[model samples]
Target chain A: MKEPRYLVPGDYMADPAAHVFNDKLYIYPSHDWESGIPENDNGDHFNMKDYHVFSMDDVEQGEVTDHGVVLRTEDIPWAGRQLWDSDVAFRNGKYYMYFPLKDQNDIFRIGVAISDRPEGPFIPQENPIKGSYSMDPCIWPDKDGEYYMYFGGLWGGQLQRYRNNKALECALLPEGDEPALCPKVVRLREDMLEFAEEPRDLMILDEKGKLLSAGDTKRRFFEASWMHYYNGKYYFSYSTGDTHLICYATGDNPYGPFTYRGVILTPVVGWTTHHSIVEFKGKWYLFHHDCVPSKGKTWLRSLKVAELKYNPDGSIQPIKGTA
Target chain B: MKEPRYLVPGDYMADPAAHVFNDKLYIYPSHDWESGIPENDNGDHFNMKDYHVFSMDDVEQGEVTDHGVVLRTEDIPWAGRQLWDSDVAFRNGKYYMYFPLKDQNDIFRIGVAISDRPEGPFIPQENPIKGSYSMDPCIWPDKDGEYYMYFGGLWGGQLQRYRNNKALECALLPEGDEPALCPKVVRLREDMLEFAEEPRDLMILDEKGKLLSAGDTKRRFFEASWMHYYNGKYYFSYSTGDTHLICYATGDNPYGPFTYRGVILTPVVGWTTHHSIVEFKGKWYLFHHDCVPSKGKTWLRSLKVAELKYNPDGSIQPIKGTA
Candidate 1:
């Protein structure tokens, strides 16, 4: 059955915290603009960004809820004007949220926060994950007993990959480059609250192909996001230019030589596509967000799910329906 | 009352056609892949776009329907891949559509189609309204006996205002002013649909004031669109890059001395914003286009309505609303 939206309690549809835990789905898109866009150095206001969360017992159950915002921008220091790009994963018996934030220098990067449960009042890790120049981090474990994650492609940049080689010792945006300057993979130290090494860029796109660029255009901003594992290969799907259209490239290994894949969602309807994939009750489904063409700025982003078709090659086809 | 949507109705709340003209307060958006971004190119076994018609009636009901299709690629001889950039207006007892189509070379230009009904089987004009560089045409009726229209901005073009100026004809992308051109007004009877007497380099941006250079890191793709007359002054609005970020400029008249007004919808929550100022139900609103976060390409665009406010200096503020 195609489940209807549960964004609220009994027909109360609105923004909330959302994500997936223990094979369950949860979500939390931004609920409101705490303050309007803050002006730049030139004295112009830029709208602030934040997100909430929600989840479903069955990954395929389209129904979601308005759990309200579990996190906000004011919570983080050195955060410049906004916060967004949130993903939650259950790690070491606790919920770990990797989100994107713009720092005081006004540059964007990824930051980590932790909580005891899925519904979070997430506390940060003293500083951002990497240096400036990135945001939207995702963490996953590989067969080698190692954890790896990736983020970026905001403004069409490329997907960046990082490994939790060593224990993280409270790094900031400007971490003296220690993680990179030094190298080591720290074993899991119980609390799961540590990193061993620094992250690096994929030397090449998957399929041994070169990037698609026109000399001047920044082709690397593949907008790396939404890493899904089906079969064996890891599907790294991210958004494209001005930041609405969604496209992807795949990687054989978690640390990828990710090759470009065509669009997952067909173009023509909406501009941007953000999503997650899950399986439930013998059904595999894809969950994502979209804009209602008419509501100018009122981001009434409702959660939607649809049955997905997996190609034999282990890659996902362009998404076509709102189901 | 909120309108209910059904992807595939099951005998209950079944609306094969979401909006029926006979229903009061029924505002449905008319959409069709007729000439839009598509997942597949084949009509027999491929995906298609939804040409939308957003219709609302009696304040109690509103609906946007896939107005079927008004025109297709085959209908326009020059379409090489896809067709988009469509605008609809009621005139002379018929609905007139001005849209863009690419030739075998993939260069897009403007074309006109006329249909006797609002929801139509439109007939394309034998020839395009403008030359090769012309795309995204906005046809405004000049009840003053002389008709004028505003278009051009996609590829760093301009508000090439057309007056009935003849005696001079130039290619859309002129080389050395082959045909004498005028700036604000063109003579009548000039077979050129997109006629210009004086073609000048686009020197200013609508919002990002200053001479937009080809080498600027912030340079974008799409540009200004419609010019609206409100409060005795004219305002021109356009999109930047692929972000759907919008900028506006005010002019004493429809033609010159336009001053840039920065972003209308900065990439805060939603995706891109392609907008037009539409006055409906006795109130002025910005009729813009935006995308949902994750419902990948059901291509179900939510029609957005933004209320417009006038500035104290006789200008207007950028549209910023959803409800």
Candidate 2:
């Protein structure tokens, strides 16, 4: 009954993020409205003016809800209409959707939209998360309950000295590209509206326990950062542009000295890739997007899912998508 | 005193619009901050956060002015930071800057910024012009004091059937595509605050007097529409993505019964090209952007200018750019 590996009907939706609340997995994916249409036909960017949420209680059959325009650019007033890859969390009886959009001034900033229900209309904050620049937002709460936000990709959002680096101001990634030492992180206050502390670099490690430099050729960060805890291990997963692989690194603590592991998902058929992992009914599933069947252009993508399994030592299996 | 053909320093700037006021030619350009930066360095689509106006009574040896932060994204309140290519006009004793930007919802709209001075500290309208979509705005005032705006391109903006053509949502030029029959136009109210009528097609034609269909391979309309009067002729010039030339068509009337004349300038040293033309102090000039010198990526552009000439028959002589 399930010949197709994708979760949706292969319409134009991408940048899948999955969250499990009350034993049901709720998925938040960006609606890539511009797929398949000839570029001559329309001029709008490959973007989402609003978002929809889908939920599944059964792996074989999921109830896809429309979610009904949870957030729109008009609501934000200070942001543009690029509601990209986002993650939602339930805290204090309300749901939070963390998203990245260009502000009215065209600077990429992260803003959190709040909803009473996971699928209802969410209200955007008047202001974005202060001091955050770059795109792709994933919020992770440590098991002990400290909230952390990891963001930045491309424009050196993860770099140590981005705006200050005169060389970086001229952005050409040569063989020795300098990203930040790791994905940038900050402590989220209880309100989730502001940062508790200034954001700093996240340090990643090679398998042999040596620190990767600011421009690590092999194990550098690209974009779409997600963190989760399973079996007392912290899984920091990201998809880098260089290889376009959804790779993971593990650590003993929530914040790492994360040890490099193998990849979870290979490149999808598009310019970029993003992903998240969630458990439903005791099995883990990998949520990512691909441009297959439709064979949409890089900007136009669709969301898909494949079953994810781990080895006995807490290593991830390479989740696959069609080429 | 006579050095480079560039209007500004080799620093980043693009989409130059020249307006002559009181014997001085003022050049307005979108700051090109994305230049010299790696395309993958970050995901900010364009890096122009502000605009600058340069002026000179003499065309040669241009000097940059401290126009002093004319308008900013923060001041707009309803759009993102992509302050892109724009044009300015003097009417009703005020200088109105017409620009195309994405609204908070990421939909492109044309908005006007007003300044008392030609080299302005232009103030933007809090809300963008209502019922406008697509990008690249050019405003032309007629001999009768009537003002018109021309916008849209490979996207639906150039198509009369665009809104009705749902299947044509993606963008790129192809043969037999259905854009509107002509470039879109609307009469402006004296206030420059709202449109006098709904946008209608400004039909284009071939020299032999046949209608140029929506997707006519030869002499079709594209983006960056600029209209100016030269020697009692209405010259409508635009840069077509297909050929990347600043081509022009002439009409005796402000609208059209126009004839495809010739190209004013060919493609610059970049993946994309945009342009504007003006006659200053009895000398005509072509203003455009290029991606040389910095060896910057496509989004990174530098503004330049060159002398333009018209032959006896009203066809334009080709203009050259200095890298």
Candidate 3:
């Protein structure tokens, strides 16, 4: 019930993606457990095994309920390992949980699981969403009723290993002054299980309309993409990866060619920063995770919620992970 | 020649290995260049193509001479790319430069080059040393007149890709609670072009004689191995890689079973920390590199020298890379 308090006292969860369903704020996060894998830049240590669902009625004054493991690695037929960062989308009375995991060949692919309830024991499809590559899938419905999935991350997420939607043996990243790698966005079909079209680069540019260079790490998109509609504009926020900042960009449309905005969150007490923003009770709140609970052990992170304020001009006031 | 001053004004060089030869401090360092390869955990961006030699009469007040490139990747018949940290040893009226570069197959292998002069246009051997795998070759001679090479690094140095001197497709790193991964040391044959024996693991332990856990990153071995005999003890120093600390251990013999001692150098302005310790003019000095001159570009590092002080207990006083 406290601002920035861990949603679960004893359990470790990270990369929180919160959404309101049936008037209850539901949090979907990766269940982090000690897999004994040594940490590396490839994120091999974050050997998360399953997804857990938690719900709270009032973020500032409500007790959280853990709905237990909604989906396990064993339950996913094509999953190999590393079930990292998942999001849930409701369509036609069915809940779809989009997840990123390594497939049988050790390559990352996005998969969809279906459940009748927001807190689900979801059933996964036999295979990942066809042609999906890389990780960190964030599915959100635009104001016009079209669902878009924003995804991709560098290094361990395997985003750099792809070009034009095809996998490459050797990754080629943008030079420091070159245009930064952009996250991919695709409209989901009515079924919400497949892409309605080819994924396009969601570009984030500066206020002057110039693209953010790869070297601008403090503001470039790294992973954990989340979109929230506020003040009749689309707000796209993402982690800055190694720099440990959460920044946002604004555009008039869901598909950004967005203009870079100010910081949304400062560095958390961890190697990673991830979050989801939602409006609850006419106030904005941030759902995120930090390594504080684990005493800075990167792989073991705890989810927390903090109230976020917006400037009169629609810019976000930066929030610190720690007071 | 102030302490911690860059050795070259306009040229980039890194991973300094200083040796006293011919009454001069000869610095053998990797010549850093703009390779346009994006930086990664595998160190692909450090596409150094050659090694340069710099010599000084006095570390505190002498002018450094750039003797030009001692060896280049093009001159090494087996070198593929990435001419990383190197060291030079004088033996039997000949100067031997030990270097690590990727072979034709892109696998790291240690190679040897020879020249009659310490600052040389050294001729490389036709192939890398047999049974050698990984990067950062530090060759130092013990008081017993035997030459030993200390080497290996994790991530881009590809040390984790090998087990027992054999390459594996998949890497297995020691868990946090497991005994830390070690640097390897091998006695060089009289010819100085081949190994006299199989490489042995150089173990570093705590004061209680417990093996440092792999998770003990601040004190564990990472790369840039250097050995200097001080106060009748074998001092083995190395970089803590991602942690950006230079730490040392002492043992009764060159081949350790060494005891973890203390930090030698504090954090530098870059993603990597590498150095070598040498005794010149009856005073000890640290020959190292930092990214300060390049404004914090990891691959575009510059060589620097600093005075090293030892306490009455024979332990080193930690030196800060920045004043």
Candidate 4:
């Protein structure tokens, strides 16, 4: 099998959040288009409009099937624009697709869409998740039967524009010596439609157990949060946004105080790097995206899958982004 | 009558170049979409992909018809991307659509497509006009039976990147005190698919007869070259670009050292403004575009039209961009 291959060649999609449902690998990615909005530090140019789901029977030699557009901005009552990175959670007999989109007021908020099938024409809730704000929502179904939601991004993602669940007129960022702004996580209620409790900081610490500083861009959490259980240890991984590395940390509990590990993937051809790691049929596969097919157009990125490996000590090996 | 009204409420189209073809007001505008490419000064954010023609029988009361997908980038053999501002010309019982798009090497060039009807599934030439170098193509049919093409835009428009019709390694803009760089005008061959001669500088000078200085951005040749015949005299108009105004000049001939007149349009909500003027049923109308509908998104502008008036002295009355 080719080490890294573009999963969808004809269409543009990014921020792959891959999962296994009923023994089939299903991928949910942000549908990209030529939004024509000028790019700014606020990521206004990532004016994504919908979501598409793809599924495959085999990881190495499988035909990817596009399930068509599952959800569109116009279908969401509270959505203003930009249906960005999203992930899905399977619970009971229903599937919940957690998505981050701008509300009618132009603030990013997380919203949930319900689908009876893994591939769905999902129905968005009348409003966004009540206490949710900011972008990039990842729904992690933890090992203990409880589900948790991870979310947040700096700058255009607008995580810095909020404090104590309220909007701030001016964005605030941590100074170099201060503890880095952390991603937020909250336990999900059984309905998978509301937060069970107030969100808390999912912190990553150094070897000495000190929180990573704001200046620790190479290791600190920026966006793209994912969790996987390996050998009874919970591994939390995230993007190092501006530094463009996919780094991970490990802890015993789902809510981290996890210690910083190392990079899982090198930089791709686009300005932003986002990925999802999952084990399918006993082999771990990394699903990510790069701008190579779109000729380095950051927003017009394409999705790819590569084999992910781990050392005997349970540490992931850094994977190269091959064109 | 309303001062300015959006011509297409549901679709985004900009850079209106209205013309009277067979007594119908036909608009040739660049189609805008969410390109997802980041915005840059090079106008990369205005990543237009195709052209759609809209028409009406009456200026203020008629239903506008969309002639869908007249021409697409993939249909043009030499085209790369960014199909920008274009104009339509009718002659020899055929309609010609003049467009500027990036070539395979990413340099902007002009190309022509032809159709039998005013609205078209126009067929493109195998290649762009051989010596064409930049963008914003305007086709002016002279009273003397010659068709002249006016084109050029600075910076992202790539007008400054060409010298003597050759691409330069570095762009060269005139110094503040230097003579302002001029837009280009060249007579088109009878077939309308080739240039009759090398393009010449279409100069705009102050009333005192000195060329407008590069510092004179408020009244200088920038982009959006348009020509209209008013009572036996020639009127050339253009966008002031960074200053966000549409200004014009008057000349005795189609190709001119035209004398700078006054502002034709005030700043619109978006960054760039383009317009065209034509007389239909004995009354003149101004067809233009602004970023009001999309809430001030520069590249996702919408087309607009308002009645245009001229003074007894043959000068245009300055118009405001009323949302």
Provide the TM-score for each candidate, comma-separated.
0.40, 0.49, 0.51, 0.51
Best by lDDT: 4
Which of candidates 3 and 4 reaches a greater TM-score? 3
| Root-mean-square deviation of every model | 27.3, 11.7, 17.8, 16.0
lDDT digits (tens) for residues A208-254 of candidate 3: 99989999999888999998899888899999998999999999988
* Alpha-carbon deviation at B211 in model 3, angstroms: 39
Query: In candidate 2, what are the lDDT values of residues B1-323, reduced to their tens digit?
Result: 22227766656778888887887778888887753445542224565678778787677665656465687777775555477778888888999998777554344567789989898588887667655556677888888788988876654232321442211222334456553246677788899976676676666666776666556644677677788898888988887765667788888876655677877777678756788889876777787888876674677787777778889987888765432
Model 3 clash pairs?
Answer: B42-B156
True contacts kept of 1: 0.00
- When 1 and 3 are scored with DockQ, the better candidate is 3
Predicted model with the maximum DockQ: 2
- Where is model 2 more than 4 Å wrong at Cα? A1-4, A35-45, A155-181, A213-218, B1-323
Model 1, range A131-190, lDDT digits (tens) per residue? 223445555656666666655542321111212321111122112212111111112223
What lDDT would each prediction earn against the true structure?
A: 0.45, 0.70, 0.84, 0.85
Worst 10 residues of 4 chain A by lDDT: A162-171
lDDT of 3 by residue, B1-323 (tens): 34466778689888888888878888888888998788776567888898788889977767989898778888876556788888888899999888888754455678788999989799998756656778888887888889998998887777776666644435678878999888999999999987888788998999999989999999988888888888888899998987889999999987859999998888888878888887888878887888888898878988888888888999999887662
Q: Give the TM-score of candidate 2.
A: 0.49
lDDT of 1 by residue, B47-107 (tens): 2222334345522234434444456676664344334456655544665665655433233
Angstrom error at residue A153, model 1: 2.7
Runs with alpha carbons beyond 4 Å of true place in candidate 1: A1-19, A32-50, A59-63, A130-132, A156-195, A203-208, A214-220, A242-244, A268-270, A293-300, A321-323, B1-323
Once superposed on the true structure, which residue ranges of model 3 sit more than 4 Å away at CA?
B1-323
Q: What is candidate 4's CA lDDT for residue B196?
A: 81
What's the count of clashing pairs in each model shown?
127, 30, 1, 13
